[PDB]
Each structure stands twice: as structure tokens, then as C-alpha cells.
Nucleic acid binder design. Structure first.
Length: 102
RNA sequence: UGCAUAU
């Protein structure tokens, strides 16, 4: 009996040029039409909620296609960007070993 | 408030 975990897995997609009005539900309706959304982020600033964010798909299966369909769309008249995010950290902690053989 | 990676 081995680990037998899932394959597609959640991704953080960055979203940009979006109107100043867009929040959690306004971003997630735009991607969640293809599959399912877990969590959604909008960069938190001194002005309040910003015209820039991220979306957390349930699985890469819809995260891949969704960014492909949404990138180059002009939501609320603003040609957007969508790509895979940096998430929390760029200093990966998942695994380590003293050797590098095999 | 058009500030653009996770102030």
C-alpha cells in the first residue's frame, strides 16, 4: 500500500490589469466557470483592494486552459495578463538531502 | 485613485 495521491493538483494563477472593483468573487467567477476555485487573492494595499491579484484552482487541468482562454481578454475594457504565480515563497522547503546521486 | 508577486 503506497501513497496513491492525486495528479493534477491546485495552482495559483496571477491575474492583472483587472478593474479596481474586482475582488474575491469577481475574479473567481471568471476562472471558476471552467472547473472549481478554492481560494482567491487581491493584493492588499493602503488604498484598499487593488487592480491586481491571484486565483487558486482546485486542479491544474482547468488552471492551464482557463489562463489560456482568459489571457488577452479585456475585462471591464482592460486587456489582462494571466500566468502561474510565485505563491508564498521562492525559497523551496519541500525536500532536502546531503547527497545528490541517483 | 492604474500602485503591478504574494508591503
Amino acid at each position: 500500500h503506497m501513497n496513491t495521491e492525486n495528479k493534477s493538483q491546485p495552482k495559483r494563477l496571477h491575474v492583472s490589469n483587472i478593474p479596481f472593483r474586482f475582488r474575491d468573487p469577481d475574479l473567481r467567477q471568471m476562472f471558476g466557470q471552467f472547473g472549481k476555485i478554492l481560494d482567491v487573492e487581491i493584493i492588499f494595499n493602503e488604498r484598499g483592494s487593488k487592480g491586481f491579484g491571484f486565483v487558486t484552482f482546485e486542479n491544474s487541468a482547468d488552471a492551464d486552459r482557463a489562463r489560456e482562454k482568459l489571457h488577452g481578454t479585456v475585462v471591464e475594457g482592460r486587456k489582462i495578463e494571466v500566468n502561474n504565480a510565485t505563491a508564498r515563497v521562492m525559497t523551496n522547503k519541500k525536500t532536502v538531502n546531503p547527497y545528490t546521486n541517483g
